[PDB]
Amino acid sequence: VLGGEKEMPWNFDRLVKVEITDALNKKGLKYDDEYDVVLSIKDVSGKD
Amino acid sequence: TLQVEQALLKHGSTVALPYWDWTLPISQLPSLFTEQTFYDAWKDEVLENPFARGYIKESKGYTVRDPQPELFKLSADGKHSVLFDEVLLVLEQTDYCDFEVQFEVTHNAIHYLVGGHQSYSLSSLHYSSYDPIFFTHHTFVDKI
Amino acid sequence: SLTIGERRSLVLALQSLEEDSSATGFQALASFHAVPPLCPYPEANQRY
Amino acid sequence: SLVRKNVDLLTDQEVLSLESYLRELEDDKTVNGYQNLAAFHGEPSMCTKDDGKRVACCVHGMATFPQWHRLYVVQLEQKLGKKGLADIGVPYWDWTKPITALPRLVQEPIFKDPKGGLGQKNSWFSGEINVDSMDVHTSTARAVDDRLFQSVAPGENTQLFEMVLDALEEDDYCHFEVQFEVAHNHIHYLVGGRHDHSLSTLEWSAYDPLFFLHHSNVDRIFVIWQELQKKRGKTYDHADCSVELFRKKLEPFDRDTNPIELTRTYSTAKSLFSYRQLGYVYDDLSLNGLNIEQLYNLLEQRRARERALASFTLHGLGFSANVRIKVCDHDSHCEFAGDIFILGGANEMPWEFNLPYHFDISKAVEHLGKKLNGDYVVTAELYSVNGTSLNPNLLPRPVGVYRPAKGFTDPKPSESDVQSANVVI
Ligand SMILES: *[C@@H]1O[C@H](CO)[C@@H](O[C@@H]2O[C@H](CO)[C@@H](O)[C@H](O)[C@H]2NC(C)=O)[C@H](O)[C@H]1NC(C)=O
Numbered sequence: 001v002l003g004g005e006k007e008m009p010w011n012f013d014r015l016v017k018v019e020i021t022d023a024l025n026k027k028g029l030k031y032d033d034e035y036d037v038v039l040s041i042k043d044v045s046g047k048d
Numbered sequence: 049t050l051q052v053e054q055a056l057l058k059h060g061s062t063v064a065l066p067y068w069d070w071t072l073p074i075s076q077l078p079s080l081f082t083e084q085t086f087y088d089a090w091k092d093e094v095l096e097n098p099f100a101r102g103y104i105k106e107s108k109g110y111t112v113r114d115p116q117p118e119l120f121k122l123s124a125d126g127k128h129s130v131l132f133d134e135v136l137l138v139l140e141q142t143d144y145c146d147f148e149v150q151f152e153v154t155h156n157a158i159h160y161l162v163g164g165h166q167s168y169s170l171s172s173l174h175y176s177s178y179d180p181i182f183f184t185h186h187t188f189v190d191k192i
Numbered sequence: 193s194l195t196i197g198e199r200r201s202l203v204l205a206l207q208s209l210e211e212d213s214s215a216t217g218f219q220a221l222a223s224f225h226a227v228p229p230l231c232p233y234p235e236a237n238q239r240y
Numbered sequence: 241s242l243v244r245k246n247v248d249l250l251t252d253q254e255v256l257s258l259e260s261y262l263r264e265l266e267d268d269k270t271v272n273g274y275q276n277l278a279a280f281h282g283e284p285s286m287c288t289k290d291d292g293k294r295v296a297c298c299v300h301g302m303a304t305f306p307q308w309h310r311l312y313v314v315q316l317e318q319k320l321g322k323k324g325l326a327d328i329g330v331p332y333w334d335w336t337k338p339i340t341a342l343p344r345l346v347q348e349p350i351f352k353d354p355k356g357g358l359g360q361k362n363s364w365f366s367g368e369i370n371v372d373s374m375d376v377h378t379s380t381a382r383a384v385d386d387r388l389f390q391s392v393a394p395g396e397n398t399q400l401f402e403m404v405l406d407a408l409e410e411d412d413y414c415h416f417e418v419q420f421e422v423a424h425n426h427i428h429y430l431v432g433g434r435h436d437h438s439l440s441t442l443e444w445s446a447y448d449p450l451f452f453l454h455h456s457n458v459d460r461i462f463v464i465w466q467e468l469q470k471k472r473g474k475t476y477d478h479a480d481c482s483v484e485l486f487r488k489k490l491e492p493f494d495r496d497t498n499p500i501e502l503t504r505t506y507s508t509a510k511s512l513f514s515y516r517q518l519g520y521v522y523d524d525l526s527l528n529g530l531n532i533e534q535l536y537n538l539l540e541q542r543r544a545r546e547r548a549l550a551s552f553t554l555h556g557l558g559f560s561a562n563v564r565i566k567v568c569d570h571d572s573h574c575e576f577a578g579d580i581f582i583l584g585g586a587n588e589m590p591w592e593f594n595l596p597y598h599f600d601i602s603k604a605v606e607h608l609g610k611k612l613n614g615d616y617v618v619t620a621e622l623y624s625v626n627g628t629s630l631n632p633n634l635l636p637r638p639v640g641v642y643r644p645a646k647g648f649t650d651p652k653p654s655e656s657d658v659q660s661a662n663v664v665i
């Protein structure tokens with residue numbers, strides 16, 4: 001996401017999609033199995 | 049009936065108890081009694097109208113009103129209740145004792161018309177003084 | 193320049209108002225000048 | 241199962257039976273207390289936050305709202321039945337018909353004895369919250385708003401009716417969630433009103449039995465939507481969205497502390513998509529005289545109608561609020577447009593929607609007189625529970641959308657022959 005200090009507030013309406021099928025099948029886990037999604041956000045400055 | 053006005057004034061009255069003229073056609077009970085609860089927000093608390101029920105300090109119950117079909121009957125012209133004719137009859141005669149004997153049952157009537165078939169209502173005089181419509185009606189009686 | 197009759201009338205009328213607690217009560221009427229604020233109108237988020 | 245009726249068609253003896261059972265359930269608490277059952281829904285809730293923040297257990301804004309509340313109502317009806325009553329379940333109050341006043345069961349403040357004698361409390365009029373930790377030992381209230389009885393001219397009907405009609409019209413569960421929560425969130429505010437302890441809030445909203453009188457009809461229209469979608473032929477028994485949320489187990493009915501065993505049997509969210517096994521059947525599946533075929537045809541014909549709509553995005557507030565929506569001409573001739581209600585509470589999970597909300601604005605634009613596909617602007621005003629307004633920049637600005645008639649096509653782009661010489665490639 002491209003953000004700066006002088007950004008007028010903005011918020012989306014509907015979720016954005018990312019494909020996961022090609023990794024879930026490659027691990028063998030069906031979508032209903034117990035699995036987690038972990039995301040780590042790093043700014044350009046370098047702070048998590 | 050007069051006795052209650054001194055208590056009301058000393059406790060913060062504004063006008064005396066109004067009289068209800070039931071000789072006029074009666075669509076239903078007056079909306080002042082018919083209303084249940086109103087909100088004013090001055091105390092930020094809804095207030096229930098004390099002109100529907102009455103608490104009893106010995107029985108822990110409350111009175112219950114009941115309309116009766118005959119109360120809604122109307123005269124030939126439609127501008128008077130059926131009780132109008134007998135009210136005129138009471139008015140017309142001369143002697144005071146005859147007036148009283150002809151007059152008692154007249155105001156006794158509404159007690160039974162609105163008291164229904166409940167032991168705790170205006171039907172029995174034992175507890176009829178626990179409903180303010182009784183005060184209003186006897187005020188109209190004094191007016192007669 | 194008052195006399196007994198009307199002086200009694202005024203004092204009794206005011207003492208009648210004082211212990212009232214109605215919509216046209218002494219407290220309610222005198223509340224217009226000051227706290228609680230009800231003006232310009234309670235709908236506005238600023239009250240004074 | 242238990243057959244279910246609407247309140248306006250019941251007779252006296254069953255009313256007396258159900259009121260007797262309700263009184264004998266609400267007087268005693270033990271663990272089978274009506275106050276505890278309400279606290280299951282609201283404050284004081286028991287499902288603490290996963291961060292230990294002591295948050296409510298009430299599901300609002302998520303996928304499992306209708307299922308959780310249907311489980312709640314069936315739990316209470318089974319609770320009542322276990323006390324010895326085996327005739328009728330908790331009846332449903334219909335408001336789709338143009339309403340004028342409250343139903344008879346919730347009218348009298350203190351019930352009369354049918355034979356005549358000592359009176360008895362009317363629970364259906366009101367209940368009482370007697371929490372000692374929060375030192376609130378006071379009865380609830382019904383701060384009714386007068387604007388719930390809009391008897392309008394025929395042809396068109398109450399805005400509640402049209403809006404819930406569009407809600408049941410829409411043809412996807414994930415969108416049905418959003419299009420349903422707004423409809424559910426109307427009566428709560430409009431009955432709770434100014435008083436804090438009422439239906440408008442969320443801490444003690446369910447103490448008044450109007451909660452169940454409402455959620456019964458909620459489940460009814462949910463079932464009619466399921467049957468309509470089944471007839472139109474799309475998959476409904478499984479949801480292609482919020483699968484993780486469905487996999488999540490409901491709380492706190494899972495734990496063994498619940499005396500009712502049916503909740504322990506059906507703690508999973510998946511099984512609730514079928515209502516027959518729960519044990520109650522609605523007598524009629526017609527909406528104010530219109531049955532499956534008529535409503536199907538009406539919805540199909542209405543899905544080819546030009547419309548102007550307002551799109552919204554929303555989240556939690558922490559306190560319920562009205563939003564009056566306003567349509568103006570561009571820069572002034574600006575006229576009233578409509579209303580929206582949102583529910584908030586002190587203890588409630590931060591909820592956000594997965595889809596923008598659609599609202600009808602076509603009639604207001606027509607009143608303004610501009611063409612539906614013309615131009616205009618939309619603004620919003622926010623009011624709190626206590627009537628007063630608030631800084632209207634908290635919510636994101638509304639947007640306008642034009643929905644064309646089905647079969648419409650865009651104007652054809654130009655083809656050109658040599659593009660003259662002004663063009664640059
Ligand atoms: C209605 O209730 C809200 C509850 O928040 C009140 O908002 C608070 O008002 C006080 C001053 O009156 C402020 O100090 C708080 O910051 C406000 N709270 C929030 C969350 O903004 C509001 O004042 C009440 N209005 C009326 C007319 O009673």
